[PDB]
């Protein structure tokens, strides 16, 4: 009747230290869960911000396309009309062709340096 | 809340020792966004455990969505880099095509004119540039 | 022992507290720790992405400006054609174009030389 | 060889209206930009209106802004000029042209 009380009172001297262990680790785990939600929330808002910046780039890129399309539509008729067309006229042609070539060279050099850097930042 | 915190994290609550309760206040990891709340019994201990699982369940679900929006971003990024490569190329093309038209116009509209001074100053500036790269 | 069945009021409870203690003993943190890892991982992907986003956002503004400068230059050509022979001597814009063009050339190979050295130093 | 012939000119009272034409030949008109140019006998050349190959990229001199309208039919190789609310100062020879040539002209007098 009474010796039993010595069992349950020794179980409680076996379940108390469990409780404290558990409560300690709960206070630890729930700290993790709070860090998570905080870091999740921060992540999410940057994720939306970057979405925005991306869409801005998409818009600028559409704009550029429109600009370039405008530029070609403006340029082909000039090219055609100018197509249906002397010491000075021959010398002047050398002078301005020299410019055409130089521009052709410097653009190649540009294009080549870019492709090198493309192979670089890989 | 403002003062009201101070007005209810004291004295202790539901039979908590005034000494252990005071130890939680100082051992508080983020008193800016949290208060000590007594949890008595293995039941509140499990209740808290199950809340953790529910929220971690929600946490993981966001990360899967967000993960989704990264792949989209990454692919959006690669497309963007590609269009940049084209449009630089087109621009380089168009730019040179314009220089060709302006040139044809110059020769034409100056037909039968003396070579002219400022025109011979280009020649030099152009010849020195061709030489500077050879 | 008359109403002392309050030992049954101390038997059923001990188990309740024992069978929950076992439930606590069963739970782990592994999932909560994936969440922790996954966050650090996605931060890393987002960061490289947003870095490259700024890199070629610069590429895009430079491109937009230049396309716009070149659109102006084509409008010069259109102005030249429109102008009749009697007013061509007042068409000074083509001259400004070419004068601007050669100083742009001079500025270009200076950059390209500079870019070359940087690229050599980047290799050593 | 750019060949241009204009017409539709005449003598009108202040406030009057007129519509000029320029027939183009010897060149693929649809690809070229065109101008209307004028000269009063004492003064110098003044462009009054421009237009691009496709009838876009139009411009006007402030003098005639709101009063003149420029247009073209590429199919009939024809350049037009509506002139409304005409003034004595609009009195001149009206040429149609680009950098490659111009026509004989067509006289426009607005009496005073």
UniProtKB/TrEMBL annotation, chain A:
Function according to Swiss-Prot or TrEMBL: Essential component of the nuclear pore complex. The N-terminal is probably involved in nucleocytoplasmic transport. The C-terminal is involved in protein-protein interaction probably via coiled-coil formation, promotes its association with centrosomes and may function in anchorage of p62 to the pore complex. Plays a role in mitotic cell cycle progression by regulating centrosome segregation, centriole maturation and spindle orientation. It might be involved in protein recruitment to the centrosome after nuclear breakdown.
Biological source species: Xenopus laevis
Biological process annotations from GO: mRNA transport; protein import into nucleus; RNA export from nucleus
Protein name (database record): Nuclear pore glycoprotein p62
Phosphoprotein is among the record's keywords: yes
Coiled coil feature spans: 1-60
Family to which this protein belongs: Belongs to the nucleoporin NSP1/NUP62 family.
Location of the Nucleoporin NSP1-like C-terminal domain: 1-91
Tagged with keyword Ribonucleoprotein: no
Alphabetical UniProt keywords: Acetylation, Coiled coil, Cytoplasm, Cytoskeleton, Disulfide bond, Glycoprotein, mRNA transport, Nuclear pore complex, Nucleus, Phosphoprotein, Protein transport, Repeat, Translocation, Transport
Main location: cytoplasm
GO cellular component: centrosome; cytosol; nuclear membrane; nuclear pore central transport channel; spindle pole
GO molecular function, one term: structural constituent of nuclear pore
Compartment annotation: Cytoplasm, Cytoskeleton, Microtubule organizing center, Centrosome; Cytoplasm, Cytoskeleton, Spindle pole; Nucleus, Nuclear pore complex
TrEMBL record, chain B:
Included stretch of the parent chain: 317 to 450 of 535
Subunit details: Component of the p62 complex, a complex composed of NUP62, NUP54, and the isoform p58 and isoform p45 of NUP58. Interacts with NUTF2.
Family as reported in the entry's similarity comment: Belongs to the NUP54 family.
Species for this entry: Xenopus laevis
Cleaved signal peptide residues: none
Domain of life where this protein originates: Eukaryota
Protein name as it appears in the record: 54 kDa nucleoporin
Cited function: Component of the nuclear pore complex, a complex required for the trafficking across the nuclear membrane.
GO molecular function, one term: structural constituent of nuclear pore
Location(s) in or outside the cell: Nucleus membrane; Nucleus, Nuclear pore complex
GO terms of biological process kind: mRNA transport; NLS-bearing protein import into nucleus; nuclear pore organization; protein localization to nuclear inner membrane
Stretches assigned to the Nucleoporin Nup54 alpha-helical domain: 15-134
Keywords of the record: Glycoprotein, Membrane, mRNA transport, Nuclear pore complex, Nucleus, Protein transport, Repeat, Translocation, Transport
GO CC terms: nuclear membrane; nuclear pore central transport channel
From TrEMBL, chain C:
Any coiled-coil regions, as ranges: 102-124
Protein name: MGC84997 protein
Protein's gene: nup58.S
Subcellular localization: Nucleus, Nuclear pore complex
């Amino acid at each position: 009747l009474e010796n039993l009380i010595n069992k349950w009172s020794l179980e409680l001297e076996d379940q108390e230290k469990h409780f404290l262990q558990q409560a300690t680790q709960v206070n630890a785990w729930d700290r993790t869960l709070m860090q998570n939600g905080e870091r999740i929330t921060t992540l999410h808002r940057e994720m939306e911000k970057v979405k925005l910046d991306q869409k801005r780039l998409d818009q600028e890129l559409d704009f550029i396309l429109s600009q370039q399309k405008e530029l070609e539509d403006l340029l082909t008729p000039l090219e055609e009309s100018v197509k249906e067309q002397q010491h000075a006229d021959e010398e002047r042609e050398k002078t301005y062709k020299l410019a055409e070539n130089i521009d052709a060279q410097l653009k190649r050099m540009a294009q080549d340096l870019k492709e090198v850097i493309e192979h670089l930042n890989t | 809340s403002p003062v009201q915190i101070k007005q209810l994290i004291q004295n202790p609550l539901s039979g908590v020792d005034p000494i252990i309760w005071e130890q939680a206040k100082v051992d508080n990891p983020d008193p800016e966004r949290l208060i000590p709340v007594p949890m008595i019994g293995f039941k509140e201990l499990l209740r808290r455990l199950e809340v953790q699982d529910q929220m971690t369940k929600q946490h993981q679900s966001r990360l899967d969505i967000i993960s989704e929006d990264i792949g989209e971003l990454q692919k959006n990024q690669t497309t963007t880099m590609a269009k940049i490569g084209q449009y630089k190329r087109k621009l380089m093309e168009l730019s040179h095509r314009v220089l060709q038209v302006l040139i044809k116009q110059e020769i034409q509209r100056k037909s039968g004119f003396a070579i002219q001074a400022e025109e011979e100053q280009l020649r030099v500036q152009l010849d020195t540039i061709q030489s500077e790269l050879n | 022992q008359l109403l002392c069945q309050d030992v049954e009021n101390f038997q059923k409870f001990v188990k309740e507290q024992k069978q929950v203690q076992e439930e606590i003993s069963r739970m782990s943190s592994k999932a909560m720790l994936k969440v922790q890892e996954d966050i650090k991982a996605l931060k890393q992907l987002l960061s490289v992405a947003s870095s490259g986003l700024q890199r070629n956002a610069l590429a895009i503004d430079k491109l937009k400006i230049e396309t716009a400068e070149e659109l102006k230059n084509a409008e010069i050509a259109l102005r030249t054609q429109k102008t009749p022979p009697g007013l061509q001597h007042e068409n000074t814009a083509p001259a400004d174009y070419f004068h601007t063009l050669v100083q742009q050339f001079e500025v270009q190979l200076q950059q390209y030389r500079q870019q070359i050295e940087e690229l050599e130093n980047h290799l050593a | 060889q750019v060949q241009l012939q204009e017409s539709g000119g005449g003598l009108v009272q202040p406030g009057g209206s007129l519509r000029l034409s320029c027939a183009a030949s010897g060149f693929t008109f649809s690809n070229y930009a065109m101008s209307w140019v004028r000269q009063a006998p004492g003064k110098g050349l003044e462009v009054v209106s421009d237009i691009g190959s496709g009838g876009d990229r139009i411009t006007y001199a402030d003098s005639v802004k709101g009063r003149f309208t420029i247009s073209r039919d590429n199919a009939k190789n024809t350049l037009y000029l509506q002139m409304n609310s005409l003034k004595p100062e609009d009195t001149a020879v009206y040429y149609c042209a680009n950098q490659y040539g111009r026509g004989p002209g067509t006289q426009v007098t607005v009496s005073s």
